[PDB]
Design a protein around this ligand. Structure first.
Ligand SMILES: C[C@@H]1O[C@@H](OC[C@H]2O[C@@H](Oc3c(-c4ccc(O)c(O)c4)oc4cc(O)cc(O)c4c3=O)[C@H](O)[C@@H](O)[C@@H]2O)[C@H](O)[C@H](O)[C@H]1O
Ligand SMILES: O=c1ccn([C@@H]2O[C@H](COP(=O)(O)O)[C@@H](O)[C@H]2O)c(=O)[nH]1
Length: 454
């Protein structure tokens, strides 16, 4: 029998988009989806609803919290330092969430972050499903019970080693472990420290789920299932679905002028601003390769326009071979275009998948975020599908020569490391796109959800 599932993702494009890709996959199999979204954001989401008779949006009013910009709904509307306030706002939707569950009565609700939800759902006879679209390797490394019990004894040297029983080995740099140690105790909404929230979600939910497949994410999902004693499901890799909006002709025309495989595409998401020094090193590094490039970047900290912040003489040198641009673009459609030979990525979970299923060579430039960093290590050192840009051990900064080097290595047909990551990327692409991989992931997924509501 078909299920009725409610979706309550975090207020961010990086969560709304994959939750919507998955809803389309579930509705194709006959399940009804009640999709809770911020009110104004719904306009941007309609293009992705491929089953409007089965997927219904229910808007939420993102309540004012002191310090939150007027009308702000998602992390694309506020600086990264204001994320905790937006979380306080999402906590404050509790009243409209209880009303929606009462009227719609789903059997399951997929959610992020809101650890007060399982109490509500069990009182209504609803099952709570904490559904992550980030890497289970990340949750495993930072939020398994062994880390939580040290409480305030957890320090930078502690986070250079995996927790007890962690299934794989990789090395973090000193500045990365320092990031993890300080950010985990920062309050993220309603006075709750970041890792304590999440741990509460993992502890109190009925079941846990992750984007991913057994062949990549399995070892981490197994570890989490033994640690928390409840089912940890895999949805399959959530392959991007086709939008009902074709590629903007301005970009199609401009991309179409380059020879196949020659363009470097660089994008670091929609949540972060580089510092001006690193903004310059990145762009000068791209220029040094001599390849055409398209860089999708916010203006650096302190600056409001790209043109203000460009290195001196930059526009006059690169001419028509390079564009630096600030707006939201159709990244999935760009990564599909045959001009793109190389993808310089911040290693966000969605961008990782979008790169893996395409032909571009991957250059990994993770920004300061636990999932980004761990994605980059796995991609660079375990799957070996891309080349990571060298950063200073203690300061976390790169040179333009390190950017130039990484792109040159993967674009050089005769370079053996470039050839090796190409071959490894093809192997991973062939697995993710295998005719029965996602379908049999979802087969198991839906069976296990059926068990959950039984
Ligand atoms: C400022 C950032 O704040 C925190 O991340 C905030 C970000 O979490 C990301 O999603 C994340 C979640 C997460 C995801 C969904 C959930 O339901 C949930 O309970 C947790 O958990 C993490 C746990 C970690 O130990 C480290 C992380 O980097 C993340 C993370 O990035 C979101 O995609 C972003 O939109 C959000 O801005 C972390 O401390 C991070 O390291 C730090 O750089
Ligand atoms: O200009 C942009 C910036 C980001 N994205 C999309 O936003 C998501 C960012 O997720 P993540 O890579 O941060 O996880 C991805 O689906 C990415 O394709 C766009 O479509 N356009």
């Amino acid at each position: 029998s078909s299920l009725h599932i409610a979706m309550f993702p975090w207020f961010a494009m990086g969560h709304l988009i994959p939750y919507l890709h998955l809803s389309n996959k579930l509705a194709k199999r006959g399940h009804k989806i009640s999709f809770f979204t911020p009110k104004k954001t719904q306009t941007k989401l309609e293009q992705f609803n491929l089953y409007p008779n089965l997927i219904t949006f229910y808007p939420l009013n993102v309540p004012h919290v002191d310090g939150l910009p007027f009308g702000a709904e998602t992390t694309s509307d506020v600086a990264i330092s204001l994320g905790p306030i937006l979380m306080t706002a999402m906590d404050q939707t509790q009243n409209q969430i209880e009303l929606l569950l009462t009227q719609l009565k789903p059997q399951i609700i997929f959610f992020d972050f809101v650890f007060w939800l399982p109490k509500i759902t069990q009182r209504l006879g609803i099952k709570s499903f904490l559904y992550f679209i980030i890497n289970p390797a990340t949750i495993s490394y930072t939020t398994s019970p062994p880390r939580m019990f040290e409480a305030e004894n957890l320090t930078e040297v502690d986070l250079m080693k995996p927790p007890k029983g962690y299934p794989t080995s990789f090395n973090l740099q000193s500045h990365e472990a320092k990031h993890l140690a300080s950010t985990r105790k920062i309050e993220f909404g309603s006075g709750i420290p970041f890792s304590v929230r999440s741990y509460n979600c993992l502890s109190l939910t009925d079941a846990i789920g992750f984007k991913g497949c057994r062949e990549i994410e399995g070892p981490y999902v197994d570890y989490l299932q033994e640690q928390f004693g409840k089912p940890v499901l895999l949805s399959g890799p959530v392959l991007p679905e086709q939008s009902k909006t074709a590629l903007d002709e301005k970009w199609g025309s401009w991309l179409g002028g380059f020879k196949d495989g020659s363009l470097v595409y660089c994008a670091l998401g929609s949540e972060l601003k580089l510092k001006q020094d690193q903004f310059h090193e990145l762009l000068l590094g791209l220029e040094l390769t001599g390849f055409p490039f398209l860089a999708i970047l916010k203006p650096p900290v302190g600056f409001e326009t790209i043109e203000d912040a460009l290195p001196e003489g930059f526009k006059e040198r690169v001419k028509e071979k390079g564009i630096v641009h600030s707006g939201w673009i159709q990244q999935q459609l760009i990564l599909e275009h045959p001009s793109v030979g190389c993808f310089v990525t911040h290693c966000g979970a969605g961008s990782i998948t979008e790169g893996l299923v395409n032909n571009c060579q991957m250059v990994l430039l993770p920004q300061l975020n636990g999932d980004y960093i761990i994605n980059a290590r796995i991609m660079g050192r375990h799957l070996k599908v891309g080349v990571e840009v060298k950063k200073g051990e203690e300061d976390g900064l790169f040179t333009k020569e390190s950017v130039y080097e990484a792109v040159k290595i993967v674009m050089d047909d005769e370079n053996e490391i470039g050839r090796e990551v190409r071959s490894n990327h093809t192997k991973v692409r062939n697995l993710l796109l295998r005719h029965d991989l996602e379908s049999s992931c979802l087969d198991t997924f839906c069976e296990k959800l059926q068990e959950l509501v039984s």
